[PDB]
Design a protein around this ligand. Structure first.
Ligand SMILES: *Cc1c(COP(=O)(O)O)cnc(C)c1O
Ligand SMILES: *Cc1c(COP(=O)(O)O)cnc(C)c1O
Ligand SMILES: *Cc1c(COP(=O)(O)O)cnc(C)c1O
Ligand SMILES: *Cc1c(COP(=O)(O)O)cnc(C)c1O
Ligand SMILES: *Cc1c(COP(=O)(O)O)cnc(C)c1O
Ligand SMILES: *Cc1c(COP(=O)(O)O)cnc(C)c1O
Ligand SMILES: [Cl-]
Ligand SMILES: [Cl-]
Ligand SMILES: [Cl-]
Ligand SMILES: [Cl-]
Lengths: 307, 307, 306, 306, 307, 307
């Protein structure tokens, strides 16, 4: 009904309905699973889809797989080509969200994987952008602590990490908030439940540094480049404290799926300059012109699909 | 090949009918919780006994509650479904039974919100080693056990096993059979799929539950057996790493692992062997209990009526 | 409006004469320690009973010692001053009595040098809810409880309540009646103004004192009553957050809060209600004790002679 | 004895009329936040200059916001009130000015509900030591500095000083003039009432703000002066305890403390003395600034019109 | 001049002057070194020396050596006999303090030992007892933190541990105190710089439990036995807080060398019942009658030397 | 066999004269601090160069100060003594020189109080491997590095190596050449006898000094060489464990270890080899510097006058 015509699985583009499996097949594998979120952005005027920083996502997926210790099976170039092929084959001409997901198949046990082989699918579906809309969310700080390198490295884009995200997002929802921010075990600001967080204070952009215990977000990376290069902003990656964020002029989440999400308040402290505030607005607009292929300066970040 | 049946969402179904799409359950797996339950086949009686079925069903309900899955399955239904399934499968041998509950809602990891609760029960043959004398060499992992700050170990969640996997994968590449965890404070927690006991000078010593461990039912059984049958002094307390190096004996216990003797820890050999005298007594008593040959603990057994 | 008297620096003084300058006590407040004590009015007897007066006076002495206030007011004086004040005020009803001690020293916050010790006792009408069945919804705070490293919770210092205020303010704006704290290690400590108990499978469980909590006198009372009157097993131990989500019942206790049932924690509902069976028994036993109708514990009571 | 006036809740009031009841402000004190601001009297000019008045008024606004006090007094009002008070007091000498804001709410410590915001400003004579060469011996405290988990040090709250008091009281009884804090992770934070700087090999080093310190305005001033006037490299970073034992020079800075040289830390003597060469230069530059004799930084000064 | 006639070294009693070595011989070995402190107590009336809990000390030394991973070389019985032989040979008839010290000889490097053999000497010298004197010390809590199992297990009686002790004792001395007490990394009471600590409050004896991060003191063990068995005191081994110790009725250090050392104050808070307070006094007296061989109930703790 | 001389307490003495008693220095070793210094023999010039002698002498003085040893030896004396000794020994080859200072006072570990300061300097042949291409396999230890709370890593104290030994002994029994430490917060600190560098995408990354590491002089050298000769971007910062798994190259550096390439970490292979391109450049530049063949860094060298 509302399923794509195809997916990619284990080196092959296949009709959706051929990837039928048993209920009991993938539960143990899910504990090993790592994934990527990738957007294809549809430029109607050009009649072209641009995949955003596809190679960087493919590379991070390879790194995640490596950190899980999955044997080599899929190259970066194969992941990139498979993605292009799948988006083309699906023949949906609109904004999409693409999820490669890799998993090890080994022991029918959760505790220990043993002898394993590596498998992977890529799943592409329509997904709206909101880059043309001005909106914002109310955030709280969670009473649950972010995973850290001691227990579950946040660098690894593992499915299991999201159980931690879920503790926080479920608490935000029952406590009257749209979204939750995490503190790390040391009590410093880490990231959102599915994205990284930026603060604007006195004309400066401030974001937790990578060793704060966060995923090395590609949207985050993009934003830092755009802030420095297009807007000439000072950007500090540093340790960030909870109460300083209460006083931010502006704040936003960023991630592939969430794009640039302005934050109106944090623990009910309202960002002084609104949401999206002036600087967030500029970053959001620049980002949108980049990802839709309307900004020649950042062409190398885009992979045209050819449809 | 495969069992004849599964139980799924209130009904016993033929194995072959439980087909699904490859992409169906990856997000759900982040919410998933499970139980391990053994059925033990007593050939002389021609009967299967399920060990502490109601205790497992209750812990499953607690896990689901702690995930905030809406009510859907009662403890009594879980118990009856399990009995029905083991009988229907008509396999006359040691089995391992896995009830596994999951919430279905958003095809997103970061947040589920208004979702429904689903569950299958999967019973498969699984050998016992209770008649074999064997032992494993353990290391302490360089990875830290999850704690209540980040991922409560009380909840039998699939996601927790990503942490188990860091440690067990390190044990395997470093020449050990099995890994033990320290908690963030540096105290002894549990094994990657089981709890741990130490014997020193006639006394049984095991990390207390607030050490950051699952409230193991085999652990609970062992404490009852040690106190009531053998009159051993049993301490649940904070346990230090180096004291375990000097244990006379040590063992893992868990539903799947049964009673697993440990020969050495970080290459320090338990001086009374593995299984040492006390482990041997406990292993034998446990075996006579679970196979239904010890009337003192019959209340822990659910006969399936395979006759 | 106001009580007829208070007690201040060794003397009962008419309310209106205890006037001071705006700038007198701000620095002093950083050193200040206090107690909460209830007087319970038994109408049938026409008598007021002060609950565990001497124990509170002793804890006040300990707090003052831990602040290093020079000796000035003995336990005996605190007890007598309290009795005298409640009698002089001639209010025949449930009261809440607050002795508050402070060092007078440097007009600086950072440091006091040589200091003298001062104290007032302030008694005011305060209703009991021990005849009412009610309960609160609690959350765990995202703010951490003070610990011995930074601000020993053993000391009943005013400054500690700035930490309480972070949590109770968050509970209020997030839709809850009351907040529970985790300590820095992530274990269950206490409420913002009281200690917490959980009932599970017929057993009473409460964070041990080294969890980083005040040594509550209501807590101590409850442990005695649970063991002695109901024959319950009571465990003082490390308590984990998720185990409390599964408690059959839960309650706060403290002098002001009395026995306050908890209906839910982080929206996990206590399965046996609020007050559940065991809480109800403890609340009722406590009420019969403090109003002087249980002679087994009469030695905890100081009759005022009203 | 006493200033002729203070400012309170929108009005200048004669000193003697600001009388209150003993029991009025104890609960309020737990919510209280304050600022320290100096007025420096330039005798030659016959003028008082208030140092970075607007920055202090803004930090006070921030503290009040972090306590969640409803808006009542704007930055502009705080600045004008300060000017008016110093003028009205007509004291022609170095002063120390303390605005103190507090919420008036529940007569309880644990929790305030709906509250209103109040504030007084209290100006008093206070000597400068910027013309004197002196130094202090410091120890590291065995008590740990508050952190964002429990009591954010960013908030200039009275309650924070209970933590300061643990350390300064220990320094005093153990033979030292002043105490430095480690944060919970064991890194150098700040003094009990000021920030700390170290000089090593011609470089200035100071704990970064996320070390768990107040965002000191004297600290900010010093960083500007070191970089702009002396062309020194200044590093804000994590600082370790033992590296400070090897500093060539060290000093405290804060509004009240001004620039206070440190002779030794845990009896390790700063090798270049106290004030060492660089501290001496910074102290002198700071003095010329605050007394209005350095026109490069005149925008930091508010002339009172005395 | 003032040196014993003999020591024991590597299986042999030797004249003192034969154990000459090069300045550069033992510096790397010292990093590996572990030791024991043992008292011989001279009962003049009997003309006998009694060594206190010699076998327990020998066993702990073997454990320390094991935890350092020194190859087996010296048995418990040899250590005990060597000690007896040496005390006899030295022919000093008075209170002595005996230090066995074991070390690995391997790499001329500190970082890493490599291939190693195990060596050991025993060094016995006159040492006064003060068990007939009433005296006390003023203690402070150190600003330096006690070593823990994460970094340097306090269970192991290693020379290196005392560098940590030295930070605290040096600070006590320069700050006007006799002696320092430690907090562990979690901020809880651990032990003294060379002994364990006990508090008396409301007729009860309270001491940090072993997993507080302390050496498992044999004097501590003795005291707990004596308090329970002779005095019928309630003794709690538990987590202990700093401020509760400020309010103790009494307090004391105990260790082999320090015997029972009363503490008059802690951070200048004076113990309410003096030093030695009533209970400390009773324990000190009972201890003295035991170690000098005047209490038949505890004869098994004593090894008579035969002189 | 042995060098002809040592330096001890202000004088050069014949090796054979520095005899002592077995029992003399065990307590002193707890206070002891040392330096490692290399002399490099340039055969073409027939000269020995001491590398950064004054920097080492200064760090020795700082260590001694931090131990609170009374003043006794000046930096200038240490430097001259070293030169004198290397010359007197008349060995024409690569040497490793160890000045080692210790306080002598009480024959007790727990406390020294009013003691005197002593020092020897010990120069011995030691091969360089700067002309060999080799690499080591590293693991992260399950033991935590000492920190400023317990045992400041800044101080080059013998006692700190007990902590090194836990990790290096674990590496050896677990099949690795060398161990890396995490600090108590779980961040990358240093090797057991050296500092560590990572190369990722052209950038050199090394833990900052407040990570809890010795302020390595080889580390300092490397940062100067990388920036000034090669124009590499060098970050001193907090470093995470899993980021190091993905380093293109990695190496240890220390006086004794020189520049030691790391082939893999926890069996993750550095993808550019060992020595990788950048390590190779740094190793070669370092070699040309220390042997006196690079005039740009001549100021770091002290010629001994062996000619
Ligand atoms: C996916 C994700 C992000 C953002 O990463 P992008 O690469 O920018 O999509 C950030 N944090 C977490 C926890 C995430 O899962
Ligand atoms: C399954 C398991 C146990 C043991 O639990 P039982 O109730 O004895 O099966 C213990 N610890 C962990 C981490 C486990 O996964
Ligand atoms: C006042 C108070 C209690 C209760 O102690 P009681 O002696 O029972 O009144 C408990 N915890 C805290 C934090 C308190 O302030
Ligand atoms: C008042 C104070 C300072 C100094 O801040 P200034 O704005 O420079 O006066 C620094 N630290 C603390 C803890 C303080 O109380
Ligand atoms: C030697 C010692 C003790 C006491 O142990 P005993 O076996 O009673 O001599 C306690 N703590 C430390 C650190 C010690 O070194
Ligand atoms: C000796 C050593 C180093 C390196 O120091 P250099 O000054 O480069 O010799 C680094 N770390 C540790 C732990 C060391 O022992
Ligand atoms: Cl995403
Ligand atoms: Cl299992
Ligand atoms: Cl000893
Ligand atoms: Cl070296």
């Amino acid at each position: 009904q509302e399923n794509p015509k195809y997916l990619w699985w284990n080196h092959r583009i296949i009709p959706w309905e051929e990837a039928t499996v048993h209920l009991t097949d993938y539960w143990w594998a899910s504990v090993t699973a790592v994934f990527e979120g990738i957007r294809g952005y549809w430029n109607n005027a050009e009649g072209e889809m641009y995949i955003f920083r596809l190679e960087d996502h493919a590379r991070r997926l390879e790194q995640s797989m490596q950190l899980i210790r999955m044997p080599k099976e899929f190259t970066v170039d194969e992941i990139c080509q498979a993605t292009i092929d799948l988006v083309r084959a699906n023949d949906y001409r609109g904004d999409v969200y693409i999820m490669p997901l890799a998993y090890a198949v080994g022991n029918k046990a959760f505790s220990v994987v043993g002898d394993r082989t590596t498998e992977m699918f890529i799943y592409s579906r329509p997904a709206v952008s909101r880059l043309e809309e001005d909106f914002s969310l109310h955030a709280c700080y969670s009473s649950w602590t972010r995973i850290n390198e001691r227990v579950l490295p946040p660098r690894i884009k593992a499915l299991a990490n999201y159980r931690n995200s879920q503790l926080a997002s479920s608490e935000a929802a029952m406590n009257g908030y749209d979204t939750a921010l995490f503190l790390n075990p040391e009590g410093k600001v880490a990231e959102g439940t599915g994205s990284c967080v930026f603060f604007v204070r006195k004309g400066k952009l401030i974001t937790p540094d990578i060793t704060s215990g966060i995923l090395e977000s590609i949207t985050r990376d993009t934003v830092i480049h755009l802030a420095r290069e297009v807007l000439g902003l000072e950007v500090e990656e540093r340790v960030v404290d909870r109460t300083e964020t209460y006083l931010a002029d502006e704040a936003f989440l960023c991630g592939t799926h969430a794009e640039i999400t302005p934050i109106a308040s944090i623990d009910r402290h309202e960002m002084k300059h609104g949401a999206p505030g002036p600087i967030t607005r500029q970053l959001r607009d620049i980002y949108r012109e980049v990802v839709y292929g309307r900004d020649f300066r950042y062409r190398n970040w885009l992979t045209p699909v050819g449809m």
